[PDB]
Amino acid sequence: EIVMTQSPATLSLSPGERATLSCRASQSVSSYLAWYQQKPGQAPRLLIYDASNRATGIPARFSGSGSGTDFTLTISSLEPEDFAVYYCQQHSLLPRTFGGGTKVEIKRADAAPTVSIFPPSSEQLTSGGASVVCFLNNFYPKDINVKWKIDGSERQNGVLNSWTDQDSKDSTYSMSSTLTLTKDEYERHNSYTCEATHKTSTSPIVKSFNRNEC
Amino acid sequence: AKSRTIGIIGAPFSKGQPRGGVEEGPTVLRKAGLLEKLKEQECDVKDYGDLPFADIPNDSPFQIVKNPRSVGKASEQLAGKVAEVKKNGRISLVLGGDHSLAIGSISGHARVHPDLGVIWVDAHTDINTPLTTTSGNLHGQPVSFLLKELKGKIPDVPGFSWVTPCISAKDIVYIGLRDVDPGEHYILKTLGIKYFSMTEVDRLGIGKVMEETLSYLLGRKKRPIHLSFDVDGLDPSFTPATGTPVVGGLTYREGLYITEEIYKTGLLSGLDIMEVNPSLGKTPEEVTRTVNTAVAITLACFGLAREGNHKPIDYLN
Amino acid sequence: AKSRTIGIIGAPFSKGQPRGGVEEGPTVLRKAGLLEKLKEQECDVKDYGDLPFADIPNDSPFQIVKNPRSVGKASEQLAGKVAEVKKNGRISLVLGGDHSLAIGSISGHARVHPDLGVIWVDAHTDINTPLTTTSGNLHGQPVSFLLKELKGKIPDVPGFSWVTPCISAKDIVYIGLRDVDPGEHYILKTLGIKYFSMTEVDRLGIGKVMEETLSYLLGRKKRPIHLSFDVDGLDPSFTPATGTPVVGGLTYREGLYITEEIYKTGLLSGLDIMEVNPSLGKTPEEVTRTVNTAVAITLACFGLAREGNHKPIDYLN
């Protein structure tokens, strides 16, 4: 059961220079492992078949090295269509584990998220729920923690988050702080708060509303 | 004694067949104690250790043959080691690994005895050229480099520039052929090699097959015999943990009978135990049956008759 | 070529044996690719498709024989289809199903060649009358309708009014008998049928058995041979997914040897692959071993020798 480890857990390199990666094996695979190009929601396209030799329709720029423990995938001519979750795969031992994920991002100046928070509807009050999401939009990089509070006292077990793939044009990210309560819990409290935390935000961005304020 | 004077040569080599794991070929055939099971009967066993095989980084393939320089260097190193242990008068027990080592395991054996014969127990003929191959593996092409009659029909493969052909077409006998290419059977009928495929083994029985084999190789003149055994030459109900299993082959009984009749000539002078792959057993009990089978084959090559063996001293005292 | 010109006739029929599931007999022997494994070597394979078998609703039994009209109509339809494909000069590969189809599979074969022989590889003799039966199945009674010497000892079964007896008692050879009724062995010794049960197969070996079989059927005069193979005639360690498994039978090796010696006469002119039951494997791997065994038997009938096959053109170019 050879565990295959990839040394860049994440990666963010601009359209430009080399984007060398690493896949470390637990044993000597000995020039017998492969490289893939799984774009999100697609089939993992093969990059390099056995540690080198540039499989059958790879464009011009994806040589690699290996032989025989830690193998390197080089992206010499970066070509920003190639921003895909790469994977390494041992083959010559069973069972056949893959790597972990090498999500090559896009590099831009660090954008700040647009923080806003939204109340439950009156039609929800005819259905019987409470749904408040603090939305953060067009930031870079991904890492944001968002805290919820019951007028100041923190919330758990409904606080859910969700990230997108990086946009092609502005190369940013977005995160919704998904949170759902009940109708009876909605009319109890008013000042529903959202504590954002981004690297561009030196102070935690607190965006809040009151119940029936707007 | 003259026979059963074994020099074991390990060979952890896996770049002639795709299913890796036979790097731990000698590892499992020694940790199941081939040496100590040889040391009850008077076998002067000298372990020459596993070989150090270098790892060529720029291993560019041939047209279809892939990893050719690794097999060339490994078989050259093994042929040097086998000629070393046959100048010591021992019996070269090579155990791998894969049949891509048999190039050197017979070339180094013929560096000392140029008039040998080979009993090739395999499911396959292993006689593909680099041109007639479809697999592109070198565990399927050792014999074509070793036959003298295929010179000129073999291109100069990178790594095999040292290989001088060593045996003739009428000095190799196959036992257990049941998975033969069209190209391999065309070579096998053009050169007129005396083979005993599973049709003839079922026809004659393994007694008549071994009698005709020893009459074919030793009936003209006494000469060394090089049993290059393979563990898919047996039935996969006995050796399932092998690289290319082909169903309906030699039994464990018939395999032991082949080895016992090679021993009782007193002219066995080299042995190969190839393609033992201890990671293709679906249970470890399958690996256990494979390795115990290969150990019992090796022991019956070197004197362990199933009738029993006694030391020539009085026991009734 | 003259031989290996196969017209495949499927036959999804299960009303001659109780263990249903052999309706998917041709389904699994075709989805394991018998056609494409025939099409490498020069086999002009023409699939005539599975037959449409009607379902008689008022299927009243006989005294002991149950479902007799379904077997009568299915074997009449199959005998018409076999005489159709033997007027086309092909070799009737019928594959089922169950041995209740062999009535029509030999009657339609004798509508074209009235002087044939049958090599009947089964664990059982299948020679019960409707009177001497204890089972009441018709996968155990095909041969008694087909022998000419049992006319008068067969009552007019509903469905079998069309059956004219076709072969004599001395033109059928059994191989692999190991589960025989008292009534079946009384018929087998009264008619003097030359059988090769497992006593004689262990005595002589399958080489001498096939030599005496071909000398018995073809030594007098060249004539068509109809191997009506059955997959409980092999050992249940090789074909466990069959209807009536009887332990200690023919090996996969000996089964392939029977088929290869029938092929190398060049007079095989009809084949039956019966009782393949893909739902009696306790694992699907058991079904996989059964169907791969039956496919390999069929391929070795039609030219796949275990020594290998080459096309007669140069490969060393």
Added chain:
Amino acid sequence: QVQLVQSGAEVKKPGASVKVSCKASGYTFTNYGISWVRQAPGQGLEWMGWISAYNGNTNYAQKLQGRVTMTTDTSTSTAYMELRSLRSDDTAVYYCAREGAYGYRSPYHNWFDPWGQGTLVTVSSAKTTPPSVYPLAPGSAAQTNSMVTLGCLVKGYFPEPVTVTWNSGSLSSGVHTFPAVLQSDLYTLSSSVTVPSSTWPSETVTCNVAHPASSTKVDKKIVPR
């Protein structure tokens, strides 16, 4: 050319098998061997078995021995993968790829180059329910800022996915349909946006959400209050 086609996106509750076709075209079958590999979303790719088409060799994987069965159909060259005793950990995309038969006639291949396009398999006992879109959008009032966007939520639909467009897809700037997330009650939640500023009050925008597995459409007219 060399392809593998799969069908189809199937949901099974904990119940019967997930037998998936993998039709092999272009290359000669019975000369390579198709393996199978799962992928949980946002996770790695766990290998889960390999059949050869030379002769039906099973060769399954660890932790499911057992659960998978795998056969061939080498007349019509598809390859099948069943599963037994299904469980909610098997919410994965089941790819099929070709190892090559590791017999003796089959060409050298270790490296998976036909790959099938993937198969959406979520194993859950929820029921096929229509979604329930729940936004508001005061676009564009001026509460505290100059950039007030507008967005929707999609609640309570099964199975995946919904299709959310804005003004029948005409409003295109800032369209980022957010992928789904599974609840604690085995239901699903998703969202989308566009980006106006605070200086566009006359933009009555409807998110046009369609979940065709429940075959219902919810178009939400939004008016600020």
